[PDB]
Amino acid sequence: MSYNYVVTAQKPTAVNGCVTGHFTSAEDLNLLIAKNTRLEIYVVTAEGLRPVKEVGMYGKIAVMELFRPKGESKDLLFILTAKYNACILEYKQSGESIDIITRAHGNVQDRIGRPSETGIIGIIDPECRMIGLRLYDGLFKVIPLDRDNKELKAFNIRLEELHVIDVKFLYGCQAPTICFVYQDPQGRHVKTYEVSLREKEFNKGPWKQENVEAEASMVIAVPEPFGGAIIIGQESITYHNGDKYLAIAPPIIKQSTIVCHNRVDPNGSRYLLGDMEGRLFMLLLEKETLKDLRVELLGETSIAECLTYLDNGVVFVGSRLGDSQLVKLNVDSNEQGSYVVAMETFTNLGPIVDMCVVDLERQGQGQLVTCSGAFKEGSLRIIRNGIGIHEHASIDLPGIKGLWPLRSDPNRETDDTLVLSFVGQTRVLMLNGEEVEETELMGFVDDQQTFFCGNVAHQQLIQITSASVRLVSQEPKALVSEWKEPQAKNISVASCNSSQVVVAVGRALYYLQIHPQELRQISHTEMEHEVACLDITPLGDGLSPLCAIGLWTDISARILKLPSFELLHKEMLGGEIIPRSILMTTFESSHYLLCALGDGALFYFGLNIETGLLSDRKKVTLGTQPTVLRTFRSLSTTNVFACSDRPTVIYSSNHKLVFSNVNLKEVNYMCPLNSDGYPDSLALANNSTLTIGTIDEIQKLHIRTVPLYESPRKICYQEVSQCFGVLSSRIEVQDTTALRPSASTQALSSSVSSSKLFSPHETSFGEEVEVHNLLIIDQHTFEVLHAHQFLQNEYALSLVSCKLGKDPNTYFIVGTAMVYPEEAEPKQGRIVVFQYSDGKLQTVAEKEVKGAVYSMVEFNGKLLASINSTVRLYEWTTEKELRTECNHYNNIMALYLKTKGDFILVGDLMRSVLLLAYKPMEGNFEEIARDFNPNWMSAVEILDDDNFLGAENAFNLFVCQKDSAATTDEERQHLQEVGLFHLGEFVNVFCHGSLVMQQGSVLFGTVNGMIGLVTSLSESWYNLLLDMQNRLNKVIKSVGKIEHSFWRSFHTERKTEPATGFIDGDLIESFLDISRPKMQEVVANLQYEATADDLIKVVEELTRIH
Amino acid sequence: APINFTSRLNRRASFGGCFDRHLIFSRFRPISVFREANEFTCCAFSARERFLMLGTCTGQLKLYNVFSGQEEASYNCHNSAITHLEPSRDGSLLLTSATWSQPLSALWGMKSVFDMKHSFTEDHYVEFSKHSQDRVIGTKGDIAHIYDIQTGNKLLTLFNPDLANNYKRNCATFNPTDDLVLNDGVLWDVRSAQAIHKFDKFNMNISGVFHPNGLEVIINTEIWDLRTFHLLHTVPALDQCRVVFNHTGTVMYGAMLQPFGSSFRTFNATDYKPIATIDVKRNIFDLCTDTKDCYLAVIENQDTVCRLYEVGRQRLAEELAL
């Protein structure tokens, strides 16, 4: 009885692993980047990175290695996913066809055992003999790589050492030898083993095991001629090759831990090293052999998850905690001392820790403000969906039927005159600065409806009406030539170029050239049907040899050559509703053709200007009203504006057309405009008003970054003060001593807490301590207005903006906790009440509590907070203080709280969710129902009064339902889990709303930056889409040959069941991009009886809610 | 891996489980008490865990709703006092074992058709196979008996006096793979029906239990590797303890013997590290856990009663901060 729909709003941004190699061919260099479920393939060049192919898998990438086995034409890819699907991939490319082909695959999950908590480790030996996997504790899984192992059958080896830190295969050994770091109670150690495929066992390692640093974390295998192994710890770096030993402890390392490494030279001569706090290092192995270890600092980058040296001093910085970088390394230090300068920068929303939904620009349409980033990469991210315009002038002019800009002054380059066509007549307007006032003009008639006007060659103007074609002088402003149909018939369709003119009279087309004082009639034709639309836009410089036309009866787009009118290419179109707009433009040096229909449908083709060839027919839908297409240029780039009930801009991103929305109600006509009072603006008219304004950037999503330089935690919006409330945390070193100027130390007004409620803790100076702050930020400029610092060892955990009880004052409310490192669970807390006055920040009230306030929320004028294992309810006094009223005790740790009207949904640490109620008669709570399953909750939201949603650390989603019709009192309180679905992200926040203007809508943000949508469906829709989803998996072949059934199967360490209740929206929306006959293969006799067109009607309406 | 929960939790949203399990499984909260209508020996949860299954000193079997606390049924099973209970994960079968009234153990069809399926006359203790509950193992002194369920007939006996340790509390049991048996400290290849190894006897009265990873054997205080046979670890606190794991395989419950003492304790099954040592301050007779890690059932007397515990919650004394 639960029906839901899950779709991706923003694909994940964070980088999880990246490898470089010769994958597409042995000649060019590739860079591969592994985001959560997507891998991005690139070609490294001098200019930068050139993307070639971008593929989604049914699984998250856990291991990604490139290798060329013997006698193979180019490198092969190996991938293991989280659910233990292995695969080996090859790259085939014939022409424009790019497909990823799978050599071998298979699942290597063991039937019994618990996955290692340290994580999955994947390595390959140099010999290309086997693949080494650490999946479970105490075992070592091996996958032979002989060409006959086309199913990837594995075997295990008992590994007595249990807690393994890192493993590598060594170079230069007479038999495949490993080298790893394990942790005994007697500190941690390093040991070597050989591997035998015949005996399937281990044999003695080449040298004795040895002791290493107690915080040794990384193992690096040095290639020949050197050989041996480098082991990196938190204090020192060592070298290990049998007899040889070198060790250095440079003092620079002690500040921050080393995380990632990389080889520069294939000799192992030079290695890169990155640390937590952004620093970048260089490791050197001095020859004459393997003389020395020496370390030099190179600069500061983004917090590195992976580093890949590409070529010629260019390094890619894979970042999981902030924006990824492409970096150039220079040998001469810059002015300030560094060797590092940033080339480009790549957006990373992850990790999202909180977010809210605020209507900033257009009320009624949502935007997200997310708490993103990490320690030094902390930032606010403002996310808009679609393009808006910014008004500058509004005039009541109902009935406009056309718009044309016009520069009347032949000397100045700016437009100064706007021509408006009405029903059967025409008017003129000049633009003196911002005044818009009526104007007349010699040569132009005002009693006929205008089809076109504008500047033409030879310093002239042209007006094309229903009666004639009028050519006008520039400098004397007089009619110089006029054309009429020979029998004085009316003009039906018009189209004009800077030097060429083509009109239509019913079926007859006329071609005219514009010469000084002359309208030169060149040719003539009679067409098979009535004329509907025309376009002669020159795609080069401008004398177009081509004329595009669409007709009435035989509905069809035709290309004609000028002046021949000789047919070149005809494309039939279905239906009996005529086209009403056609256009030829140029997107990014590729020539396309656009043709809109009367129902709001749009066909678009490709165009060979030399031959007039239309290729790769495609079809989209834009609303319901007939579409009016027109060209405009912005930032020296050409784009197309589509006027309909869904106004849309058409542009090209990476040589594919993209359709971004326009955040308007409806646009009937449009023209560009550049005047001395309205620069680079646009002129827009609905059927009631005439507006002029400027346009945003041309992108589907615009993302504004606000660097805070410290870690944000929560956020909420106080409307009545035009502000944002942000909690943060920066790390200082105990002298407390900060590390770098961040937002909390650069506020306009700063403050500290003067509380004294907490009159035994020793700090080892140099240790790191978090310092928390309340940050308040402007809604428009986003500059830190005030930063309130909290006490020492006090963390800010919960934040609410609301008004309580009867006080019309609106407040900021914070819940904190006293966090001392040697304590296991905080015993002291605090709930503070603030108001942000006109400029200042006033402390109102406090309330001491014996625990951490992990969550709180406004509950019907009352404050509803959670302390460590208690759910409490406060009232707000007439004396402006807090008075507790209720409690709830049955839970381990109350971490997550949400409220409908008078219902309370509570998320616990290990028991999934509780449903509570408030009884006004007793002034207490009543536990209504619970879910018993041990789900490690991470987020929660209330969908409706009977369905509830949350996500746990098992990367999953589930929905619980209240069976209100209760046979018995026991069956009543079972929150029956009726939805189950494996997602693949770690959700940290749910909030209601949508990013689309004009049932249900829930947005969530994850660790990888992924933003998703969850909406509800009905029983008819569910049973249908579920049929498509099985039928698509019959057709869509997944990379790695992985079943979609297995991927989305709900999987925890305790349960593993198929998915029910949800539908994978990313899969349903891929139905549009698939080929045409495969659609007919999907729709084959599916009742629910609609086929192959009624579904395109559905999916396109589904792609519309995000 | 910080110590303080609040710091550790913040690292989860940004970027371990041992410190979390250490917190939860040192906290046990009694909530309800299960008495009998007319003033027990064994305890177990049903398959779907909605009822609690109790054995008495008169041979009876009681069934309580965990939600309400009332008796749903009552059955007579033996003429001796009940010693052990084990339902099938199918929810279709149950195993019983009494003290001295032959037949000592028996297999039962559950409530739908509730009836006696087969008899196990010679065997004190009984236990299902681990992976595929198609076979049943029983203990007669130092002798192991493997039986089929549908036929009820015997498949093979396992004994070798040259290798016996003669433990007091011997209980033969299958590995998670159903291809090994441990009796009296002796590994048996089920298929080949021969002996594999004979572990040295370091105790008087404990036989041993397998670890779910299929890699280890838990004799009283010695962890033996299942193929190397080397001594891998020594856990002192397990001395004389009957060891039960949770359903997920992360935690051990140990129960001090000499039928049991006043305290049980919980361990971290990965590294065998102690978590806590809970003292209920009463004599303990049996215990069992649900598969949901929600409830803990304990039998104990002041007149024997079964008190039910909730996991992860604190006792009032520690909650009052004295």
Author numbering:
A (entry chain A): 1 to 288, 296 to 548, 551 to 744, 749 to 772, 777 to 1015, 1025 to 1114, 1123 to 1140
B (entry chain B): 1046 to 1060, 1068 to 1091, 1096 to 1314, 1329 to 1372, 1381 to 1400
Give the exact sentences the study uses for this entry.
The Vpx/Vpr family of lentiviral accessory proteins usurp the substrate receptor DCAF1 of host Cullin4-RING ligases (CRL4), a family of modular ubiquitin ligases involved in DNA replication, DNA repair and cell cycle regulation. CRL4 consists of a Cullin4 (CUL4) scaffold that bridges the catalytic RING-domain subunit ROC1 to the adaptor protein DDB1, which in turn binds to exchangeable substrate receptors (DCAFs, DDB1- and CUL4-associated factors).
The structures were solved using molecular replacement and refined to resolutions of 3.1 Å and 2.5 Å respectively.
